[PDB]
Amino acid sequence: SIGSSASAWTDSSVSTQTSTISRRLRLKEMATQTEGMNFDDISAAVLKTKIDKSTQISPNTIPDIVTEASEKFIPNRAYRVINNDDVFEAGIDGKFFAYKVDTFEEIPFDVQKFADLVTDSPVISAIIDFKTLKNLNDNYGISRQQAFNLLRSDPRVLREFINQDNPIIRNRIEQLIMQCRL
Amino acid sequence: QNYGINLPITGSMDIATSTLCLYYPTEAATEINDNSWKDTLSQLFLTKGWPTGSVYFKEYTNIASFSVDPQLYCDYNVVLMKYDATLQLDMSELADLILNEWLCNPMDITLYYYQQTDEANKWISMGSSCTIKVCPLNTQTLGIGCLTTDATTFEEVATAEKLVITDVVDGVNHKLDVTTATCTIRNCKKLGPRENVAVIQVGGSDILDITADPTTAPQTERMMRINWKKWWQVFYTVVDYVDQIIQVMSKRSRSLNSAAFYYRV
Amino acid sequence: QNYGINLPITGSMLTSTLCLYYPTEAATEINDNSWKDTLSQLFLTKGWPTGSVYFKEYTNIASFSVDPQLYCDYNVVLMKYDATLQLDMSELADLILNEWLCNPMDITLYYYQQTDEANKWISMGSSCTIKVCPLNTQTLGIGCLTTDATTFEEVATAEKLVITDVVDGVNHKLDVTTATCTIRNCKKLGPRENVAVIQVGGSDILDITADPTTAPQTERMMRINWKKWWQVFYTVVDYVDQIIQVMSKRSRSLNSAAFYYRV
Amino acid sequence: QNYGINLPITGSMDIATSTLCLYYPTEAATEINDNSWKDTLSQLFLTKGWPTGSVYFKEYTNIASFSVDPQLYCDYNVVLMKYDATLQLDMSELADLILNEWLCNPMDITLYYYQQTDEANKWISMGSSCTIKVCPLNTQTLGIGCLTTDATTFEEVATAEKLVITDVVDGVNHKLDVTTATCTIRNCKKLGPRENVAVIQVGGSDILDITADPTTAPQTERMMRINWKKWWQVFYTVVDYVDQIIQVMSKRSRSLNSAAFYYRV
Amino acid sequence: MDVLYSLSKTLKDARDKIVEGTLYSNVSDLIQQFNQMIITMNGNEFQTGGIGNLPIRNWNFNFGLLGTTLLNLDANYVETARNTIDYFVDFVDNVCMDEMVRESQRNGIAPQSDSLRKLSAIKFKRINFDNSSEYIENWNLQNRRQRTGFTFHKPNIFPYSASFTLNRSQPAHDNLMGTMWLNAGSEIQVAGFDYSCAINAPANIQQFEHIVPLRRVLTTATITLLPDAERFSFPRVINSADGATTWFFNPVILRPNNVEVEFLLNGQIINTYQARFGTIVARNFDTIRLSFQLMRPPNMTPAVAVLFPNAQPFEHHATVGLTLRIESAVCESVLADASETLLANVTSVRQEYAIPVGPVFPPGMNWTDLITNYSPSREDNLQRVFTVASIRSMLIK
Amino acid sequence: NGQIINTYQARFGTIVARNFDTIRLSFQLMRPPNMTPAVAVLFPNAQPFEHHATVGLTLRIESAVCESVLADASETLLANVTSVRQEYAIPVGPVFPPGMNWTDLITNYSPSREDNLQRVFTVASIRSMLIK
Amino acid sequence: NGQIINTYQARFGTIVARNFDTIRLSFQLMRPPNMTPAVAVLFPNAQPFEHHATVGLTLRIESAVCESVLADASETLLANVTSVRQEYAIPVGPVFPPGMNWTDLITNYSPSREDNLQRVFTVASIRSMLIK
């Protein structure tokens, strides 16, 4: 297979294989093996808010909306894993990148080690992917704690950035939110 | 976007439920001698892996009547024809008519004078009473074994046959005379292999020829034969091997979403 | 497979058939049989090979609507205005003017509903008369009862061709004399650009879309005026250049039929 | 000096009373039921800005009689035609005859054999009794659905119509037969848009076609429609908006001082 | 090579400073330089030309010196110096004219002309006034394996190639979805057009992308990203790709939604900008990838609602457009510019005497083909010829 | 002098001309041979028209060298001349057009006006070296 | 640069090309004019086919000289680099692709990667002169 040996998760060619790996890894969100916030939390929150605001839905209609929303929401998911000061990230759409936590230097991609480690290791939803992170590290003078928590997607620092109303984080959040539709 | 302009494809070499109709003759219905057999066969197909209510069944009175413009409205079709020791040419015509795509242009019998261009061109006539009489012509439109004004010296090629396929030598015009009130002749050009259907023969001795070409006798894998004495055995056999039958065939290439200006009928 | 249809493509900066549908009225009025030879020879002089032009006859607009059978690649059809037949005229023009994909319906037993604006119910036959009753989630008729048939609501009576629409989204129970008609559920895919309609007298009645607020006039729906059919024939033949420039030829039907069947 | 040799013009892009005739049908005169109405309308036009005695008025007995060589002798003309639900082709012919410049050359029916050259060529026949019968010919002057010596097998194209426009397919000659004692046929070639006139229709349903071209249905701005029940309302409406009517039109381009060898009639 | 630049600069400085009446104590340096140049130059002949119509000329050198006897320059001393100077100027001009035309496939960074090759000998190495000028300094620094640069204004680097790529296409062109772009000079304008106007599009949003490579790495690029492109905003009728039919284009310009501009290097992300218009700064990039989204108006008005019929009949297609301009940039290799006439000098000298096309430069010095398939040998030869051209343009104004 | 020096056919992009004083442009509008419904209708062979056909070329010179003094939009000379002139509301001179309207000056370009322009621009360039 | 330098027609065997960067191959499959029973039947003009026709060319370069550093199967450099790299399980560098997968390195051949390859191969060649 693509990993080190046979396992139930290793079963543009690099892009396609990584996309399949990410699509299968999407199910990890039901495995309680995540750190911090995750995509499904945002989906549930927006579903609750739009249920409360809406009034044109009958009690016979809730199951269909919930079933469709739990699946179709956020097709563009990203995941990143950490190994010895190195970070590998892969996207469902076909994006794949690797970078270091010190100065965010571009790192050549190795599929083998990614498949080796993602099988049994912490996984964190990549709300802040590499594009936003690099733009933030360039255009804004953040400290090491903020960046390290962002790679972990700590709610406190993310909400502090929201308070500061940084245009890049607003753009990322709004792009994520606009995708929430049937 | 727009289809039809076939942009060249480039792949690689590093990679690892629909409608199903079925026809049968009336003799099969009489031999079955049952009412709820349709439900039984549908449930058997459900067991084999098809949805219930997705397997229709039709019927034809006779091989003759089935020949009158044989339509098909299925994504997967298998036609059962009962062999008869005297209608060999009729069976060959039926197979060659329902086995290949036919692209037709209407042809008159009174004003124009029709001819043929290439070996991939044929004449198909269907009707209740088809009597086809032909006469070759020269460059000066004079008489060659038949006079244009006369009509009683034209050579018969097929009389009273419910299906008539005919072909004349390329490079010469020919005049026609046929009852338009009972038969219709259409100028048709053969496109290629129509994979939407298969033919299963009961009894028989490998009679069908799918082309007028002498030197070739292509025994297609879609042409398959069995033997029978009670129709229920044949029905069970054809139901049992559904996987092989569907694997042999494929989707009707002319019915996919690539239809746009692909010379679809 | 794909030469460039819907897939990336890079640019830079004779034997074709021609049919002609004519009503019996023209032939009866002109009262001749040699006119076919005259028209063929005129076409030859214009530059089209002889015998490449077909001619077909229809007794009436109602009869011609019964399962139309296209017989060429390019097509021009003629129709005459009627005092109280504009519905059939427009419906026939729309039907033979756009491509259709129809799923056969077992109307007798089950129920049906459409799915979107691009869905319609098409019915043809010798004598068709449809009656429908809308349903609810309780399976009881609205303004009707599910058992009796007389108390239903008329949509069409004794009509040869019916093109109808309902409130798309809710099931409905229909009824018809099936032994004298046929009903098929169809979806309008796109423009069938190999057929044009020429009006002979009238005031541009045709509408090719069930949308009430949109009713365009394309390049294949024109009008002329007549006093002797020979004038119409001569004008049509002389200006064949414009007509052949208007339509395309890549819309050939994969088989001789008006609308495809379950594809 | 001399005109006609069009020397190219060069401008820049840095810059900031005549005769008016009017026609009406007899039914309008009967419905008016007055004597001094002409003076009233002339004074109204004086109020709107035209000199008195500069607005003539004429009359035509019927749409049929108005069709007999419709002359015009005005620098500004508006023609009022009463719509009728059965003379649609007559109205179309009248509009297409009085709306475009027509350049004609006389044509015989006995000695020569006339034909057509381009799509901008037409045949116009006017007379008290116009019966037009035509017959196409081949290269060898043989018979094609009609014999030259015979005259009872020619196809009618228009009978007893006071106005007749006809066109035949380019590239073939045609022989004629028409009563010269009651009708006149003139070979004419269409020049272009004659802006000296406009057409206003009462009632109607947008029937007029200004060309034999099928694929085009040009609704000119000069073709305008109204609705009526009493003629006085229509007269008041057309008088009120004189400014718009004259602004739509323009001077007769073929009547300016540029006439010299500009192919004026 | 540096010998020629030293000669040209010394001649220009001498023509600048030796004017009537000036005090000698201000041209002592140039007097010593000129005397050394005359001492080393004499006794060695030269030959130039021999190819095409270029005039073959022979050269001699027998001149006096410029002594130190006066306190202020008089007319006669200036006249003598000027008479010598003009002759040396003609010598430099003819040597350059010989050098510019020729080329070589191999060793395309070394001198080729006989006069220049003889000049490169060691016994002439005593004349190098300075290397202050931009091109000569860059050449000298490139001689010793060091990073270089060039201050360029409107540095045309995009080859001219008008092209479009369709995405959805009817056979008769009644339902089109695709992109039109035109890369002229240093100006990129990309337009994304749709016929459906996002009425049948998935999620009512149509995705557009376009990637344009660049053969040479730039730096310090001030990028003016202005929306509402002008190259495709007017009616058009063009031939199809196969050249057997045509199509129409009736455009309406909408608001480009969520404009994404990305600059990459070596296959990684360097600098990104979302939804910013105006002027932005990029520091190091080799590939430009512009992508955005066309958004259907969520609500309309009578005219707008009529203008976008949901059904197939279409008479008004929608399009969004962007404009990419490079108003300033610094490159690592020689390129065409607009602040001088260097490429103009090369083209004029090539065409004036009709040298037959060699094995490197495509005929006529058409910049499109020259920049199309960029190869290091071609770049080196162009660098040498441009250095010689800049030498010429620093003598004749 | 009416003689052809530099010629280029279908060379869109960047071209160079060595020495010229007259520009002659010729292009041909050709009706497309084969059509499609839209263009097949929008160009009728009859009289009335809804859309006219036109082709166009944009020619821009980016850099040049002249043997005589000329103004440019890439320097600060003509602005200096007009600013100094309007500084004290001098009456219009007997040579230069009023207010240094550049179009009026370049219209009837006279050798005397050329010499005066050369002197004025040289003096302006001398002045521009100091006031920074 | 899209310009023809070396061309050879029907020269099978050994040919030499002096300086090239792009290879264009064109060949034509022609139906034989006259036939014999076997080939006369095995190529039917009808639809069904039992054997397809194909032609093919094998082009192999045996020796070449390049102006930049390139690996080869006739020396022992890339093997030295990969052996030294995997000797101590070094984390993948920010330039070279993982594990010196030669295809991955040659895919996006960058000038920086070229310079790094040159330095590494030079150092390896220095090392190979001693350990015998």
Residue numbers in the entry:
A (entry chain C): 583 to 593, 606 to 776
B (entry chain O), D (entry chain O): 51 to 66, 78 to 326
C (entry chain N): 51 to 63, 77 to 326
E (entry chain n): 1 to 397
F (entry chain o), G (entry chain o): 266 to 397
What wording appears in the published article?
Rotavirus, a non-turreted member of the Reoviridae, has a triple-layered capsid that is assembled stepwise in two separate compartments in the infected cell: the virus-induced viroplasm and the endoplasmic reticulum (ER). The outermost protein layer consists of 260 trimers of the glycosylated protein VP7, with the inter-subunit interfaces stabilized by Ca2+ ions 2,3 and 60 trimers of VP4 forming spikes which mediate virus attachment and entry. VP4 is a homotrimer of three chains (A–C) associated in an unusual asymmetric arrangement in the infection competent TLP form.
The ER was extensively reorganized, characterized by gross dilation of the lumen, which contained clusters of TLPs. Each particle type was subjected to subtomogram refinement and averaging within the Warp-Relion-M framework while imposing icosahedral symmetry, resulting in reconstructions at estimated resolutions of 6.9 Å (TLP), 7.7 Å (eDLP), 12.0 Å (DLP), and 26.9 Å (SLP). This produced global resolutions of 4.2 Å (TLP), 7.2 Å (eDLP), and 10.2 Å (DLP).
